[PDB]
Amino acid sequence: FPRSRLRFKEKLGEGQFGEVHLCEVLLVAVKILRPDATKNARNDFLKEVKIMSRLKDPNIIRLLGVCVQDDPLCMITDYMENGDLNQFLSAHQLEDPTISYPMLLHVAAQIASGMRYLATLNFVHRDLATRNCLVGENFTIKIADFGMSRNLYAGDYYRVQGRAVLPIRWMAWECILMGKFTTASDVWAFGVTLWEVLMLCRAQPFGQLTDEQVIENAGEFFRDQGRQVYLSRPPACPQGLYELMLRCWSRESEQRPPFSQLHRFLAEDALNTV
Numbered sequence: 001f002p003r004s005r006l007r008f009k010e011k012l013g014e015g016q017f018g019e020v021h022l023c024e025v026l027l028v029a030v031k032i033l034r035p036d037a038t039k040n041a042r043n044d045f046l047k048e049v050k051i052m053s054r055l056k057d058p059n060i061i062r063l064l065g066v067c068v069q070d071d072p073l074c075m076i077t078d079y080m081e082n083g084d085l086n087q088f089l090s091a092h093q094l095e096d097p098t099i100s101y102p103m104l105l106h107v108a109a110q111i112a113s114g115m116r117y118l119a120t121l122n123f124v125h126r127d128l129a130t131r132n133c134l135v136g137e138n139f140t141i142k143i144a145d146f147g148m149s150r151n152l153y154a155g156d157y158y159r160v161q162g163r164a165v166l167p168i169r170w171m172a173w174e175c176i177l178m179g180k181f182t183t184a185s186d187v188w189a190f191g192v193t194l195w196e197v198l199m200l201c202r203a204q205p206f207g208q209l210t211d212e213q214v215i216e217n218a219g220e221f222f223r224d225q226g227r228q229v230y231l232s233r234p235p236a237c238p239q240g241l242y243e244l245m246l247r248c249w250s251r252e253s254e255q256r257p258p259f260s261q262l263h264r265f266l267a268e269d270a271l272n273t274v
């Protein structure tokens with residue numbers, strides 16, 4: 001894509017190495033690298049682009065075009081009017097800017113549908129959360145399949161020097177203990193994400209616990225002596241939906257529901273629960 005065809009209007013967001021801008025060509029979102037981006041970051045950007053080229057789904061952000069011929073590299077994606085899912089839900093209250101319970105189901109169902117698509121490709125997202133989802137017009141939800149280290153969500157990641165930055169509060173117990181990331185662990189993360197949506201993003205998962213306590217909690221899952229703790233049922237969440245969350249947090253990976261079952265529950269079975 002010709003970079004000259006792009007007209008920059010606003011800077012939406014930024015990370016350690018990248019910046020997202022609103023651009024006119026028709027609005028698109030454009031991720032560009034910082035002027036002080038390392039060649040390491042450039043290489044990561046290229047890899048990121050190659051991954052995105054594969055993922056084509058109504059509920060996955062799409063790669064509309066690239067500008068990699070010159071520095072800094074550009075990635076062009078859907079512009080989503082309402083920004084990220086976390087910030088969107090935080091600005092809303094449950095219906096007595098309001099959002100209804102049926103809509104929350106619809107939002108989660110779209111996420112589930114996006115993850116269902118990724119599952120058929122055996123693609124593991126590894127960082128599913130409301131902060132990595134986007135909201136367009138008509139409550140359209142798309143999962144972001146690229147990353148950016150925004151300072152706003154620094155507290156959502158566990159940092160140790162020389163280690164990978166890990167979203168431990170969204171990670172399955174076998175993830176925390178082994179670094180074992182699979183589709184089954186994506187399901188666990190979906191459960192936490194579903195919890196966020198029903199909480200309307202009013203609280204961080206295990207928010208009153210420290211990182212080390214969350215890590216220790218994963219050890220209690222492994223041990224299985226009935227001392228592990230779960231995220232509590234959100235006020236807006238009915239028991240039946242919550243039991244679904246719990247199945248996502250089963251100790252055994254094979255006991256966690258596939259995204260096909262999760263989507264069916266949220267899009268169909270729960271329609272009678274309103």
Ligand SMILES: Cc1cc(Nc2cc(N3CCN(C)CC3)nc(Sc3ccc(NC(=O)C4CC4)cc3)n2)[nH]n1
Pocket residue numbers: 012013014020029077078079080081082083084131132133134144146147148150
């Ligand atoms: C990438 C993308 C971003 C967007 N849309 C938007 C839109 C937006 N604005 C919407 C309009 N109001 C007035 C202000 C906020 N603010 C952000 S702020 C922002 C910046 C980046 C991300 N997402 C990411 O960085 C990827 C890592 C998850 C989310 C929101 N992103 N559409 N497509």
